[PDB]
Amino acid sequence: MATFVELSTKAKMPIVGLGTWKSPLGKVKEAVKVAIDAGYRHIDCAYVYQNEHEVGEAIQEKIQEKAVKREDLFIVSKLWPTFFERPLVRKAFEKTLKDLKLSYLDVYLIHWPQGFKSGDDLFPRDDKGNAIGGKATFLDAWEAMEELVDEGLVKALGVSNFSHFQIEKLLNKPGLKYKPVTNQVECHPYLTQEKLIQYCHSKGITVTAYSPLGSPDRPWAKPEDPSLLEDPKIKEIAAKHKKTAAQVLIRFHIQRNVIVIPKSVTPARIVENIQVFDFKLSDEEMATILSFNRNWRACNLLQSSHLEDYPFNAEY
């Protein structure tokens, strides 16, 4: 049962959530049920994961058995960048909310800052695999998303994969109604995000750490790629506390007041991953872990490098 990070809306965002990317149909429902049982309240979802309907089924069950009040649940989903044109924001969201069988989302995030070709082809690409841009921007999207908050369909808005330059563009937009309550970005010992975290915090924006375990099952994973869970320098620290590497990797974010959403459909791991409130990494250990930084991203979306608002070119 987790602590919280307070958002600028005074809302309380549970500091550990369950990730659902690539959680297969036929296992994600069980994963959500096991998670809620184990004390998880934060569930990270997305339209593009195309499993929200099963997530929704699992949440409905736990609600009616009263394992949890809806108000105790913190549900996040995200707008995919092929839906930045205004009517598409509404339709994408409605499909998300319908699949989820909920009456409101706690947070709705812009999934990526760069607009893709609009429509229902989620991965518009040229023969070489490069992403196809669209003309609607994350500003056009945000505008429409703000209406969701007005109508109470969404409690708060956020962004994901944004650089500080992007955040600035958002905050300095004349006629902005709502500010982002979080920036969800890849974060872990190899990509510690010190400057971006500093920047978001100085603006009232929390950070949500995705792929905290290095996303070891991602599709594009090459054996030469570094591997956090197998890192002897991470494993040493874990051994020092008789905890697993995953638990250290998750705890690291908690002690930075950074929200963290490890993905699993394995019951034992789902439990393990929230058992991170009965130990504490020393300052020496936190400093050692931070020193592992090498600015390596497991998620680069390099196929969209050529589009205007590519977030990862900037330093932070």
Ligand X SMILES: O=C(O)COc1cc(Cl)ccc1C(=O)NCc1ccc(Br)cc1
In three-state secondary structure terms, 233 is: helix
Can you tell me the distance from the alpha carbon of 127 to that of 295, in angstroms, rounded to the nearest whole number?
A: 30
Q: Which stretch binds ligand NAP (CB under 6 A): 193-201, 208-216, 234-242, 289-297?
A: 208-216
User: Binding to ligand X (CB under 6 A): which residues in 202-221?
Assistant: none
- The partner in contact with residue 191, picked from ligand NAP, ligand X, none with C-beta cut-offs of 5 to 8 angstroms by kind, is none
Q: Which helix (H) or strand (E) holds 5?
A: strand 4-6
DSSP letter assigned to residue 229: G
Clarify whether 190 is annotated catalytic: no
Instruction: Give me 41's structure tokens.
Output: 């309240």
Whichever of 193 and 273 has its CB closer to ligand NAP, that residue is 273
Show contacts with ligand NAP in window 121-160 (CB under 6 A). Answer: 160
Binding string, residues 16-55; x marks residues near ligand X by CB under 6 A? -----x------------------------x-xx------
Check whether 211 is labelled as a binding-site residue. Answer: yes
Q: Whole-number minimum distance, CB 81 to ligand X, in Å?
A: 8
- The angle subtended at Cα 307 by Cα 303 and Cα 308, nearest 5°, is 150
119-to-15, 132, 134, 135 alpha-carbon distances in Å: 34, 12, 10, 12
Q: How many helices (H) and strands (E) does the chain have?
A: 10, 10
* CB 23 to ligand X: min, Å: 10
Per DSSP (E only), the strands in 96-244 are 105-110, 154-160, 182-186, 206-210
Q: Is 274 in the site for ligand X (CB under 6 A)?
A: no
Between residue 114 and residue 133, which ones bind ligand X under the rule CB under 6 A? 123-125, 131
User: Looking at 40, 49, 108, 190, which residue is catalytic?
Assistant: 49
Query: Which one of residues 246, 258, 259, 289 is an interface residue with ligand NAP (CB under 6 A)?
Result: 246
- To the nearest whole angstrom, how small is the minimum distance from the Cβ of residue 14 to ligand NAP? 14
Q: Does 184 bind ligand NAP (CB under 6 A)?
A: yes
Q: Which distant-in-sequence residues (6+ apart) come within 8 Å of 221 by Cβ?
A: 215, 298
3-state class (DSSP) for residue 263: strand
Burial, 38: exposed, middle or buried (Cβ in 10 Å; 0-12, 13-18, 19+)?
middle
Q: Within positions 295 to 314, which residues make up the interface with ligand NAP, using CB under 6 A?
A: 299
**Dihedral sign of CA atoms 147, 52, 113, 10 in order:** positive
Residues 6+ apart with CB under 8 A from 123: 131
Q: Is 263 in the site for ligand NAP (CB under 6 A)?
A: yes
Residues that bind ligand NAP (CB under 6 A): 19-21, 44, 111, 160-161, 184, 210-217, 229, 244, 246, 261-266, 269, 272-273, 299
Residues that bind ligand X (CB under 6 A): 21, 46, 48-49, 123-125, 131, 301, 303
